[PDB]
Amino acid sequence: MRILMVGLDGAGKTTVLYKLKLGEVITTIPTIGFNVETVQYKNISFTVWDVGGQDRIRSLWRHYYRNTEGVIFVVDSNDRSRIGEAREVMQRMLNEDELRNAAWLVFANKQDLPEAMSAAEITEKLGLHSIRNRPWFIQATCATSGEGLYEGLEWLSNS
Amino acid sequence: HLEKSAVLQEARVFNETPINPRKCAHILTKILYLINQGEHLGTTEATEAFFAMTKLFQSNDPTLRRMCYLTIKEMSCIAEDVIIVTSSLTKDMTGKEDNYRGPAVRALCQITDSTMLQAVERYMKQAIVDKVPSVSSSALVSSLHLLKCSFDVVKRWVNEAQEAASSDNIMVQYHALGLLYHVRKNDRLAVSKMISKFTRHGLKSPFAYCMMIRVASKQLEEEDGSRDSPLFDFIESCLRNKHEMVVYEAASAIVNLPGCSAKELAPAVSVL
Amino acid sequence: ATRQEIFQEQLAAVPEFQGLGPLFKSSPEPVALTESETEYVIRCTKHTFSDHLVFQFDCTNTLNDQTLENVTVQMEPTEAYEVLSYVPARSLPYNQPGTCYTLVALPTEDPTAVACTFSCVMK
Amino acid sequence: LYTVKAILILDNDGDRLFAKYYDDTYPSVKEQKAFEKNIFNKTHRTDSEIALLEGLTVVYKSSIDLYFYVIGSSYENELMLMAVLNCLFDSLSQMLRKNVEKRALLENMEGLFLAVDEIVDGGVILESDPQQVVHRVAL
Amino acid sequence: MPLRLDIKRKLTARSDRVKSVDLHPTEPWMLASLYNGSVCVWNHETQTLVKTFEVCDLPVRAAKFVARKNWVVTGADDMQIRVFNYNTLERVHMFEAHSDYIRCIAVHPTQPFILTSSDDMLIKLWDWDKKWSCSQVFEGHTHYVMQIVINPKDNNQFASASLDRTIKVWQLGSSSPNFTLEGHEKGVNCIDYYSGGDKPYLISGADDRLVKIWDYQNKTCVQTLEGHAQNVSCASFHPELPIIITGSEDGTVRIWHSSTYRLESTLNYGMERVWCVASLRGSNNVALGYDEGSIIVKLGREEPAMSMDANGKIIWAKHSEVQQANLKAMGDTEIKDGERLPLAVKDMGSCEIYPQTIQHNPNGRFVVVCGDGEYIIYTAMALRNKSFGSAQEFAWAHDSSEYAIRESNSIVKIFKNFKEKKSFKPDFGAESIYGGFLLGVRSVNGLAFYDWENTELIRRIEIQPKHIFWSDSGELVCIATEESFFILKYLSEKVLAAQETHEGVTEDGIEDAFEVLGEIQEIVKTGLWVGDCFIYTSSVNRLNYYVGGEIVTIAHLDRTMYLLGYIPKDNRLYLGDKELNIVSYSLLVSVLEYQTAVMRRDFS
């Protein structure tokens, strides 16, 4: 399943990824020269695309299409800055329309002590309840804990 | 025997979920064939390919890797994107064998942007240093194109050359010099010292002797003064070898109407 | 009104003069005023007229590093000449003659008055 | 020193199914081919110690049924060049353990391509030691 | 390439198996722990003992100075931690952290911490502000904890070595490593860090005689090194030069260049094995415990190679070991004496040979630079090699047009434009050679004077010095000779006659040449001719110029330094450190001259 894990270079998405995937991590920069990775979970056979989002490519991040069906959208939770507004909305909407054919599960990262501004405000802002829509989960994490990881996958490995 | 248009659609089928390593390998061969005899190329077709090729990368399969390089290598002066590749590239680089690495540089070199360069320099440092020459050799050639492109910054690197300057593989010994010359050849002077540099020196992967000859003469040629003490040193040596060609090399040049020293030449000649 | 006269005339297209005359004889030897392939390379030729001497300066502002600008030529003398002026080659780019001059009027009936060494500083 | 202006792999039947033009200077695929017609044809089925066309060096190994070519400038050393000419020639041969034919090529098309890239890469000869090579590769 | 280099046997002691060494930077004191069980702290400088402590009489494995803290930390293998305030050696506190043989302490400097590893297969962290809390315990062992080192770079993250052969690198959020890697095929004795922050290497030690380099960011064994002569007790990163220090279980020093990686040298103080090492972070002085004793060596130059054109560009090359690629500086702006200034940016160069001399042409112009023992002279603007050869010793013919050389034999040949000058060809015992206006050959603890065209022993004076600076026009000349110093006149005419007459003294040189004007008893940090004025530094850090019977300190300097250059026009002195901030103080040359002239009776 082409499941796209998204976010920037510099996020430390990658850190997570291999933490999960390999057990072990790697730098807080998500990739520059991509990830395609395969994971069996629950012995079900999965492709992870991990994007160190970086702009030019970011622009092109649409860049591929076929066989799309699932989103890890990594967003950094505590990110007080790049998260919402035009960017957030735009990305979400665009993605949604383009591939209305895949569940969007957003991943909120390095929650540590959360350095956001309200779990509630944001979820709403994202129109998390614009829902009447595809399997969704809003999910909390600080990477080091991995505050919600296994469910994401688990609940996911639901059919 | 076979035809392009169909194929062009069909190649993406490997990109379709299809598992059968062979099948695609073959199809790839054909493409290359179309190409080999002669083929139009272009972007759209490329771009679509860009997404197409890209997914296909859980392959472990080494040989599988090979195939890729080639293809990519095809894209160079008409190249499209690099960032994706970075990760990939990195993968060759960290990648166990040596092998993977050489192909990547090789496509890269007509095609690329200043910028990244810095980064990739480091990698270069490493290549520069490695004992299995080959890759290092692989590294070098790329540079040339990079010289095409530019290569000046490559220049900056002279130092590495030196660390490198110690060599013990013949062919390899050869390779280093080629570069070098270019480098100093923008410069008489050093070279004069270079000469000295080799002067203490004999040569590993000969070949080296030969470029140097052209060279060694080439300063002298204009009247880089003294034939007499230097040249001659070279010559006895030159003379002496069973690298008959080298002997020749000297011989051929010295074409002197009065016989600069008519005599000796005749022995060489006899020998000829 | 020598070969050198032709040079008196060649010189003549300029009009910042402070006397000339007609050239008498010219230089027995042009002097490279900057030695062998310098940061800047000068070869100089000196011209005598019945009245003045002009040193006209031939050259290839060498380094592609540079173009020299705001160029004038100082000369400072020991055995006489009245020093009228030092000339600026407005601009000199790489590998290229341009002209700069330095001008003097030649005293003739004095004991010690036209052979001279002049000291040069490029600005 | 970029020796291969171009390299061609040729029929007996005076055609070329591989060529990698190390550098082109008269354009086209086409233009290469016309040249073949003269040259190959003319040469065809017979080789030289030395052969020249106009200050350029003409290099190459044959088979009864097949033709190999390298072009460089005749302005430089027979021996090495030969050595090379062979180096290829042998390597492949050895490698193959067989005389290439028309057969050889169809018999496995891939190997050529693969081969083609390793020694010379557009122009210069990177790779060599054919046995070495031969061993070196197999994958 | 040569050892034409600084190696100093800085300080010695012959003793026992001195296991451990720890450095007091903040005042260069050193702490050492012995296999005796007594530990001592020394000021090496005069081979003087700052304090010694009998902490235990059991061998005392671990030691730290806590400088911030102003206290010194100690532990012996009574498994207790004893504290002294080093501010006497007044002993603050004691408590039992680790209950087994306590091998190593690593400290967070930024943050108030003391990290410890001990053989109990435990690493404990203790917090001093909490007053030695066991704040956290780091565990993930498989054996005794032999060593801890803090990646101080990221203090915060640290690495651990064990002889079960493995290394765990940890994150705070891992009271366990982030991971363990399977390093040794022996055991990982030691783990060490790469001085630069930029890149990252560790070296780890083994006696297996194989070295692996690792890059953390990738996470690779960058490479694995072989060549060795005996179980490497230790090998270390040179932090000053790029060299590899290798050490042995017999106490062998081998150096491989951490760039050539060629064995540069082997040294034997067969004082047996490398027990400890500790290094100057200022990267220049290092100490290691050996059995027969310990030795400390001093290994530095005091400068880069640069010479300044009076336009105002001190062109230096390198920085400290950076490529030569970096020369330039014409600046562009002005500011207050005390305050600091800006540089331009446009490198030229990227030489190879590593120098230690720069000297300008006499008009700044042609520099001859020596390095690796050979002389590259540059055409500078040109960035051309003006010329090259191998030295031994040198004089520019001061005039700016010839040069002399001392061939690595010792017998003179001189070249003017690659022509030997044999009109002059003594080749007597020397010591060093001096050029300038008047020829010096320093020989036989004498300094002997020579012509410029034929040699002549003009004079010989009492002893040998160290350095000469000549006034500008030569005239009054300044020779630096330890503490002590002299100013002289050279009187020509005598010579002309004398010479004509010929019959002379030259054993002494001829007593009819030079005169001894006066002498200052002097210590020079750096020194200057302003003309014939000696403007000088003292290493006592006053900048003084000896003027008028007077020596005056224009100013006194932090500690003493290098004379940037006074571009006279500006009348200012540019002062120079070695850290590339320039300070300027204007004088006004005229004032000096004014003084000079008037005394001379040039009042008007």
Swiss-Prot record, chain A:
Glycyl lysine isopeptide (Lys-Gly) (interchain with G-Cter in ubiquitin) cross-link, renumbered residues: K110
Binding site for GTP: 8-15, 31, 53, 109-112, 143-144
Residues of the signal peptide: none
Residue ranges crossing the lipid bilayer per the database entry: none
Loss of function: phenotype: Increases phosphatidylserine levels in the outer leaflet of the cell membrane. Simultaneous knockout of DRS2 results in inviability.
Keywords per UniProt: ER-Golgi transport, Golgi apparatus, GTP-binding, Hydrolase, Isopeptide bond, Lipoprotein, Myristate, Nucleotide-binding, Protein transport, Transport, Ubl conjugation
Biological processes per GO annotation: endoplasmic reticulum to Golgi vesicle-mediated transport; Golgi to plasma membrane transport; Golgi vesicle transport; intracellular protein transport; macroautophagy; positive regulation of mitochondrial fission; positive regulation of mitochondrial fusion; protein localization to Golgi membrane
Recorded superkingdom: Eukaryota
Compartments (UniProt record): Golgi apparatus
Record field: catalytic activity: GTP + H2O = GDP + phosphate + H(+)
Gene Ontology MF terms: GTP binding; GTPase activity
Major location (coarse): Golgi
Catalytic activity, EC: 3.6.5.2
Disulfide bond is among the record's keywords: no
SMART domains reported in the protein's UniProt record: ARF (SM00177), RAB (SM00175), SAR (SM00178)
Recorded GO CC terms: cytoplasm; cytosol; Golgi apparatus; organelle membrane contact site; plasma membrane
Pfam family for this entry, one: Arf
Subunit structure of this chain's protein: Interacts with RUD3. Interacts with VPS13 (via C-terminal part); the interaction is direct.
Miscellaneous comment: Present with 19300 molecules/cell in log phase SD medium.
Similarity section: Belongs to the small GTPase superfamily. Arf family.
NCBIfam families per the UniProt record, alphabetical: small_GTP (TIGR00231)
Protein name: ADP-ribosylation factor 1
Source species of the chain: Saccharomyces cerevisiae (strain ATCC 204508 / S288c) (Baker's yeast)
Taxonomy of the source species: Eukaryota, Fungi, Dikarya, Ascomycota, Saccharomycotina
Curated annotation (Swiss-Prot), chain B:
Molecular function terms, GO-annotated: structural molecule activity
The HEAT repeat ranges on this chain: 44-81
Keywords: Cytoplasm, Cytoplasmic vesicle, ER-Golgi transport, Golgi apparatus, Membrane, Phosphoprotein, Protein transport, Repeat, Transport
Location in the cell: Cytoplasm, Cytosol; Golgi apparatus membrane; Cytoplasmic vesicle, COPI-coated vesicle membrane
GO terms under biological process: establishment of Golgi localization; intracellular protein transport; organelle transport along microtubule; vesicle-mediated transport
GO cellular component: COPI vesicle coat; cytosol; Golgi membrane
Role according to the record: The coatomer is a cytosolic protein complex that binds to dilysine motifs and reversibly associates with Golgi non-clathrin-coated vesicles, which further mediate biosynthetic protein transport from the ER, via the Golgi up to the trans Golgi network. Coatomer complex is required for budding from Golgi membranes, and is essential for the retrograde Golgi-to-ER transport of dilysine-tagged proteins.
Similarity field: Belongs to the COPG family.
Protein known as: Coatomer subunit gamma-1
The organism of origin for this protein: Mus musculus (Mouse)
From Swiss-Prot, chain D:
Cellular component annotations (GO), alphabetically ordered: COPI vesicle coat; Golgi membrane
Location relative to the cell: Cytoplasm; Golgi apparatus membrane; Cytoplasmic vesicle, COPI-coated vesicle membrane
Bilayer topology term: Peripheral membrane protein
Entry annotated with the keyword Nucleotide-binding: no
GO biological process, one term: intracellular protein transport
Keywords for this protein: Acetylation, Cytoplasm, Cytoplasmic vesicle, ER-Golgi transport, Golgi apparatus, Membrane, Protein transport, Transport
Subunit structure: Oligomeric complex that consists of at least the alpha, beta, beta', gamma, delta, epsilon and zeta subunits.
Family stated for the protein in its record: Belongs to the adaptor complexes small subunit family.
Function, as annotated: The coatomer is a cytosolic protein complex that binds to dilysine motifs and reversibly associates with Golgi non-clathrin-coated vesicles, which further mediate biosynthetic protein transport from the ER, via the Golgi up to the trans Golgi network. Coatomer complex is required for budding from Golgi membranes, and is essential for the retrograde Golgi-to-ER transport of dilysine-tagged proteins. The zeta subunit may be involved in regulating the coat assembly and, hence, the rate of biosynthetic protein transport due to its association-dissociation properties with the coatomer complex.
Protein name as catalogued: Coatomer subunit zeta-1
Residues of the full protein shown: 10 to 148 of 177
Curated annotation (Swiss-Prot), chain E:
Any GO molecular function: structural molecule activity
WD repeat copies, ranges: 13-52, 55-94, 97-136, 140-180, 183-224, 227-266, 350-388, 390-425
UniProt GO BP: intra-Golgi vesicle-mediated transport; intracellular protein transport; retrograde vesicle-mediated transport, Golgi to endoplasmic reticulum
Keyword Cytoplasm attributed: yes
Chief localization: cytoplasm
Keyword terms of this UniProt record: Acetylation, Coiled coil, Cytoplasm, Cytoplasmic vesicle, ER-Golgi transport, Golgi apparatus, Membrane, Phosphoprotein, Protein transport, Repeat, Transport, WD repeat
Membrane topology category: Peripheral membrane protein
GO CC terms in record: COPI vesicle coat; cytosol; Golgi apparatus; Golgi membrane
Entry's localization field: Cytoplasm, Cytosol; Golgi apparatus membrane; Cytoplasmic vesicle, COPI-coated vesicle membrane
Disruption of the gene: reported phenotype: The knockout of the gene results in early embryonic lethality with no viable embryos recovered at 12.5 dpc.
Stated family: Belongs to the WD repeat COPB2 family.
Function of the protein: The coatomer is a cytosolic protein complex that binds to dilysine motifs and reversibly associates with Golgi non-clathrin-coated vesicles, which further mediate biosynthetic protein transport from the ER, via the Golgi up to the trans Golgi network. Coatomer complex is required for budding from Golgi membranes, and is essential for the retrograde Golgi-to-ER transport of dilysine-tagged proteins.
UniProt protein name: Coatomer subunit beta'
Native source species: Mus musculus
Full-sequence portion shown in this chain: 1 to 604 of 905
